[PDB]
Curated annotation (Swiss-Prot):
Disulfide bonds, paired cysteine numbers: 4-45, 54-62, 96-124, 109-136
Organism whose genome encodes this protein: Homo sapiens
Source organism superkingdom: Eukaryota
Subunit structure: Binds HA-I and HA-II plasma membrane adapters. Interacts with DPP4; the interaction is direct. Binds GGA1, GGA2 and GGA3. Interacts with the heterotrimeric retromer cargo-selective complex (CSC), formed by VPS26 (VPS26A or VPS26B), VPS29 and VPS35; which is involved in retrograde trafficking of the receptor from endosomes to the Golgi apparatus.
Location of the protein in the cell: Golgi apparatus membrane; Endosome membrane
UniProt protein name: Cation-independent mannose-6-phosphate receptor
Domain notes: Contains 15 repeating units of approximately 147 AA harboring four disulfide bonds each. The most highly conserved region within the repeat consists of a stretch of 13 AA that contains cysteines at both ends.
Gene: IGF2R
Domain (MRH) ranges: 2-138
From-to range in the entire protein, with total length: 1082 to 1220 of 2491
Length: 139
């Protein structure tokens, strides 16, 4: 139940409803070495559809690896424009040390239909880069 439409301070409209997951989630491109046995599942604004092991929390980001599943953050905030670059933040996932896992997707306006890619693990935060045409200002 999160709005996928945001207007930045400068007045640029962003519309991410085209990335919303109605039936199946997004699958993250991961060419890391730690990505051999791990799959990241992602959704924009909407919670993930049923994925075994991360049900119950309106999970927006699920790591599935070797049978086990981890909740990497729930959908609460809308995509944040805050200079013109888009970001969405899922936090308060499964326990990660003294904190909880979180997921950040950084969007970049690119004239292509892109898929989110795993970029970085910053402690308990999983960082994703999404270069795609939907990250561009709407009319
Ligand atoms: Cl779909
Ligand atoms: Na289950």
């Amino acid at each position: 139940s999160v709005d996928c439409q945001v207007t930045d301070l400068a007045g640029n409209e962003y519309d991410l409803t085209g990335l919303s997951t109605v039936r199946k989630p997004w699958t993250a491109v991961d060419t890391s070495v730690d990505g051999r046995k791990r799959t990241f599942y992602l959704s924009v604004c909407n919670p993930l559809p049923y994925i075994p092991g991360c049900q119950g929390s309106a999970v927006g980001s699920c790591l599935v690896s070797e049978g086990n599943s981890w909740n990497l953050g729930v959908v609460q905030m809308s995509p944040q424009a805050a200079n013109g670059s888009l970001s969405i933040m899922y936090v308060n996932g499964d326990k990660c040390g003294n904190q909880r896992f979180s997921t950040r997707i950084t969007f970049e306006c690119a004239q292509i239909s892109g898929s989110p890619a795993f970029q970085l693990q910053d402690g308990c935060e999983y960082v994703f880069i999404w270069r795609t045409v939907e990250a561009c200002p709407v009319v």
